[PDB]
Amino acid sequence: EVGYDDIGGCRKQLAQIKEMVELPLRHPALFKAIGVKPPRGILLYGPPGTGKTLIARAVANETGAFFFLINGPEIMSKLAGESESNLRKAFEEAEKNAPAIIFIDELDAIAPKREKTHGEVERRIVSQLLTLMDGLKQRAHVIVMAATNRPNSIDPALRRFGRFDREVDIGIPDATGRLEILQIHTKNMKLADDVDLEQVANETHGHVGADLAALCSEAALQAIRKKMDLIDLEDETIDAEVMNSLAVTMDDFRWALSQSNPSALRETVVEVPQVTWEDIGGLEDVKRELQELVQYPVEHPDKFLKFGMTPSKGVLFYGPPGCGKTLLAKAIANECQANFISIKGPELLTMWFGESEANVREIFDKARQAAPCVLFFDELDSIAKARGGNIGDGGGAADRVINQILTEMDGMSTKKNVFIIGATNRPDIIDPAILRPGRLDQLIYIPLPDEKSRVAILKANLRKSPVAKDVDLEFLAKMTNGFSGADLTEICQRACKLAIRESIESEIRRERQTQTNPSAMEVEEDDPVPEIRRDHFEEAMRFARRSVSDNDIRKYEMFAQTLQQSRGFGSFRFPS
Amino acid sequence: TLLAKAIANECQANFISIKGPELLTMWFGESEANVREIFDKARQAAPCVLFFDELDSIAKARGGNIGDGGGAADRVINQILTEMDGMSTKKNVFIIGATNRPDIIDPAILRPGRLDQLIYIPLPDEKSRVAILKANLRKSPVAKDVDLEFLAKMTNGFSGADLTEICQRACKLAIRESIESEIRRERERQTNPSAMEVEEDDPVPEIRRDHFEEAMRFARRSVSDNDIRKYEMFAQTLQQSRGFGSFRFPS
Amino acid sequence: KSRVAILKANLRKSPVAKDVDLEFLAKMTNGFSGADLTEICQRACKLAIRESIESEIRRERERQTNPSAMEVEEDDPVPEIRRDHFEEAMRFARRSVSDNDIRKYEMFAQTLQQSRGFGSFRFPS
Ligand SMILES: Cc1cc(OCc2nnc(SC3CCCC3)n2-c2cccnc2)ccc1-c1ccc(S(C)(=O)=O)cc1
Ligand SMILES: Cc1cc(OCc2nnc(SC3CCCC3)n2-c2cccnc2)ccc1-c1ccc(S(C)(=O)=O)cc1
Ligand SMILES: Nc1ncnc2c1ncn2[C@@H]1O[C@H](COP(=O)(O)OP(=O)(O)O)[C@@H](O)[C@H]1O
């Protein structure tokens, strides 16, 4: 049957559910001699196709509890006045086979009322379901798990104490989980040796477990269409050996990925960033300060408690564009192995234009659920720029979105895990309230990368590309007196583009030469340009440009010295 | 727009064009969710070239010299940026943007991951002008007597639209002359019924030199040299520095 | 090349050691004007002069205490501008001309350009 092996994604909420349900189910007799209330209901919510029903079935099988599935529309499709009988009989039958697990798939259909509550019979169904759910006499060990797309879609009374008192957001699987899902979905098709499922997994961003299964099936169907159809040898049952002779090639998977259309790309991603400190070449003072502020409270919470100091839970990065603030935030999140949530400027601008700031509440709740997390508000000054910056609106710096963010931060800190990081290229226009204590008070300045930092940035950008050892990278980094990280990335991309164009043009001509003059003996000399050379980099650097002018760096230096530690205490000595 | 259509045709990929009126309608109506629908449609029809023609229309509508009190950000452009940021997953949709006022375009549009590759389309050259005239006059019957290279060279700075207007005016003059002439000739047969019917065919069967001369008499340069100067400024406002032109590796 | 020539011309009078690679200094100065290069050279000369005056003086001050005490050796503590003086000078290197006003100069040069479209002009054959 289905078990933990079938449950893919390694998303680490299956472990939480296990810890939740073993003792109530794995050790049911224990609770008989101990006075404790187990989890009467667990609300699994997330994007559709994430395997919530699969997870519930696997838990039921691995714990031995009698699994009962109450399909939402199955009862809803039944005639009014007798569907209530179906729900009551389902609970009674689950009660009989104690311990039992009752799974309500698509719970947002039985009790969708969000206090709007249209209709008459559906109100009866929701109220009777409430009576049954609250009617659990704590006898036996029936655990009621329900599936819902979002927590707010179901009736709020279902979310109350004793009905569904604890919720788990399965969420979209990540690259590691996408790879494991691909492995589980590719185990009987005799996958080819060339295909590794790693490149596909990385390119598979935005898919869900159902999406991964559909992509694998589409690749298999492409393989079946490409071969074994030309022969057209078919019978009632295709020969096992004949079908096994085919191997799903990388090309088939690539085409399937091109024909994927993932079912929820837009959904926000809660993922441990893969970026590491290696990608950023320097910022040692900044790196150490970030390590302090974030890592120290958790690695050594006892020492923070000993001195009675509450660590700051907000940091605001300020600096010129393209210097690596987003990368620095990702790296700091990676070092602590905490989930990273990034709120770019377009999202804030959308909330501001639409006059919908309640999304800030939802974003903060999501960050709270995925703890430990690093809630990063990238380019937080976007709203101020949108309203102006030199003259702007007649009013002050306060705006709806920033006010909601401040309210959530003030109401935050309770969680002890969410850490707010803010990045802004225009510190002058940022609202001052953002910098007050209890908010993003720790201001960190990210300067233009140094020569060593520039070398590291070039190496990180060119790690994947084949770069000839002849081209000296230290010389190029030193040559770039004030290039930003974005400028270095542009130079590397232009060099790669030049190399790609030259290689394409050359092999194309070489193919004409064989077509025009068919050689008697075929002897390919391989690639005329196998790796990026000095001339490519020289031509690319010919177009190198400094995006960040020295005047805006001067303004940042002004603000930095606008956070000046006075000029009279530098020699402070105690009287002794 | 023609260049975008040609590039789409060469790749044999579907072409979707979002003209300025559509963007202005979405902006006035405060309905930017249509951008989501447009991007989804472009995604479904892959390979496609999603072209946002005259993308600067909203900025012009809000001003351009003084404009609104706020910055360049607007609802429609913000939604387009959000869709583009959430795009690239499809690997097939390609966004092409055309703007006659690059100065007022939102800078966020040009950031990496967005329409960063800026391409400048200059006024057609003499050879380009000849090709444009030939394309405009391919359908119309043009007499071999009228030299097209001379006309293209004569037009020192005419835009493609100006050349199209000249060709259309020449065709209009030819059509009017043909209509008037055959109408008179019909009077001539009604007023004085000829004993033997012998139609001499069309008095003007194809466009002649005189038609083109009269049309060129009204030729005009729509694009002034000052706006070309502003475009040249922006072009050199994307200047590749002035100190690396001689960059050599140490060897 | 112009920067190298300017540096050589400024330092012709001053005694500069052959070990200092002036071409490297010229190439490292990305967009320094002639005034900036002259300022760097003057600062290097000033640093050399200050070091020579302080070292010769402090040596004489110690030596004068004992009459005829140390040998009569005629030492020159700094007889030429050294490399360290050039690093000392470059620490204070400054870019006088901002890229924005260079932008303005190139703008005026473009406005003065001979319009466009007459490059291909050719008399009829
Ligand atoms: C002991 C303590 C721990 C704490 O929390 C620690 C923590 N855990 N997970 C996280 S989050 C995760 C880590 C990486 C990404 C985010 N954190 C945390 C807390 C603050 C800042 N960054 C992280 C708070 C406050 C206290 C205390 C201090 C003084 C006193 S008294 C009365 O003066 O003696 C009483 C209580
Ligand atoms: C190989 C690849 C193809 C691609 O896509 C190609 C593509 N197909 N249809 C289209 S669309 C259609 C064509 C005409 C109209 C539009 N495209 C496409 C892509 C980009 C721009 N224009 C077209 C993306 C990205 C990659 C890659 C590059 C580096 C690495 S690594 C880890 O550094 O080794 C991994 C993956
Ligand atoms: N991590 C996974 N491992 C194996 N199958 C998965 C996984 N995630 C999703 N699936 C697929 O999703 C299909 C249906 O999705 P489901 O489990 O019912 O979730 P939901 O009810 O939210 O749509 C299942 O048949 C299963 O094959």
Swiss-Prot record, chain A:
GO biological process entries: aggresome assembly; ATP metabolic process; autophagosome maturation; autophagy; cellular response to arsenite ion; cellular response to heat; cellular response to misfolded protein; cytoplasm protein quality control
Free-text comment on this protein's domains from its UniProt entry: The PIM (PUB-interaction motif) motif mediates interaction with the PUB domain of RNF31.
Disease as annotated in the protein's UniProt record: Inclusion body myopathy with early-onset Paget disease with or without frontotemporal dementia 1: An autosomal dominant disease characterized by disabling muscle weakness clinically resembling to limb girdle muscular dystrophy, osteolytic bone lesions consistent with Paget disease, and premature frontotemporal dementia. Clinical features show incomplete penetrance.
Summary of subunit composition and partner proteins: Homohexamer. Forms a ring-shaped particle of 12.5 nm diameter, that displays 6-fold radial symmetry. Part of a ternary complex containing STX5A, NSFL1C and VCP. NSFL1C forms a homotrimer that binds to one end of a VCP homohexamer. The complex binds to membranes enriched in phosphatidylethanolamine-containing lipids and promotes Golgi membrane fusion. Binds to a heterodimer of NPLOC4 and UFD1, binding to this heterodimer inhibits Golgi-membrane fusion. Interaction with VCIP135 leads to dissociation of the complex via ATP hydrolysis by VCP.
Purpose of the protein: Necessary for the fragmentation of Golgi stacks during mitosis and for their reassembly after mitosis. Involved in the formation of the transitional endoplasmic reticulum (tER). The transfer of membranes from the endoplasmic reticulum to the Golgi apparatus occurs via 50-70 nm transition vesicles which derive from part-rough, part-smooth transitional elements of the endoplasmic reticulum (tER). Vesicle budding from the tER is an ATP-dependent process.
Organism of provenance: Homo sapiens (Human)
GO CC terms of this entry: ATPase complex; azurophil granule lumen; ciliary basal body; cytoplasm; cytoplasmic stress granule; cytosol; Derlin-1 retrotranslocation complex; endoplasmic reticulum
N6,N6,N6-trimethyllysine carried by residues: K116
Outcome following mutation: T117A: Does not affect methylation by VCPKMT
UniProt modification remark: Phosphorylated by tyrosine kinases in response to T-cell antigen receptor activation. Phosphorylated in mitotic cells.
Subcellular localization(s) per the UniProt record: Cytoplasm, Cytosol; Endoplasmic reticulum; Nucleus; Cytoplasm, Stress granule
Shown residues in whole-protein numbering: 200 to 775 of 806
Recorded superkingdom: Eukaryota
Keywords: Acetylation, Amyotrophic lateral sclerosis, ATP-binding, Autophagy, Charcot-Marie-Tooth disease, Cytoplasm, Disease variant, DNA damage, DNA repair, Endoplasmic reticulum, Hydrolase, Isopeptide bond, Lipid-binding, Methylation, Neurodegeneration, Neuropathy, Nucleotide-binding, Nucleus, Phosphoprotein, Transport, Ubl conjugation, Ubl conjugation pathway
EC number: 3.6.4.6
Residue numbers of N6-succinyllysine PTMs: K469
Record-listed Phosphothreonine modification sites: T237
Curated annotation (Swiss-Prot), chain B:
Residues modified to N6-acetyllysine: K144, K230
Region (Disordered): 184-203
Cellular localization per UniProt: Cytoplasm, Cytosol; Endoplasmic reticulum; Nucleus; Cytoplasm, Stress granule
Disease cited in the entry: Inclusion body myopathy with early-onset Paget disease with or without frontotemporal dementia 1: An autosomal dominant disease characterized by disabling muscle weakness clinically resembling to limb girdle muscular dystrophy, osteolytic bone lesions consistent with Paget disease, and premature frontotemporal dementia. Clinical features show incomplete penetrance.
Subunit structure, interactors included: Homohexamer. Forms a ring-shaped particle of 12.5 nm diameter, that displays 6-fold radial symmetry. Part of a ternary complex containing STX5A, NSFL1C and VCP. NSFL1C forms a homotrimer that binds to one end of a VCP homohexamer. The complex binds to membranes enriched in phosphatidylethanolamine-containing lipids and promotes Golgi membrane fusion. Binds to a heterodimer of NPLOC4 and UFD1, binding to this heterodimer inhibits Golgi-membrane fusion. Interaction with VCIP135 leads to dissociation of the complex via ATP hydrolysis by VCP.
Domain remark from Swiss-Prot or TrEMBL: The PIM (PUB-interaction motif) motif mediates interaction with the PUB domain of RNF31.
Protein family according to the UniProt entry: Belongs to the AAA ATPase family.
Protein function: Necessary for the fragmentation of Golgi stacks during mitosis and for their reassembly after mitosis. Involved in the formation of the transitional endoplasmic reticulum (tER). The transfer of membranes from the endoplasmic reticulum to the Golgi apparatus occurs via 50-70 nm transition vesicles which derive from part-rough, part-smooth transitional elements of the endoplasmic reticulum (tER). Vesicle budding from the tER is an ATP-dependent process.
Stated name of the protein: Transitional endoplasmic reticulum ATPase
Organism, scientific name: Homo sapiens (Human)
Span within the parent record: 525 to 775 of 806
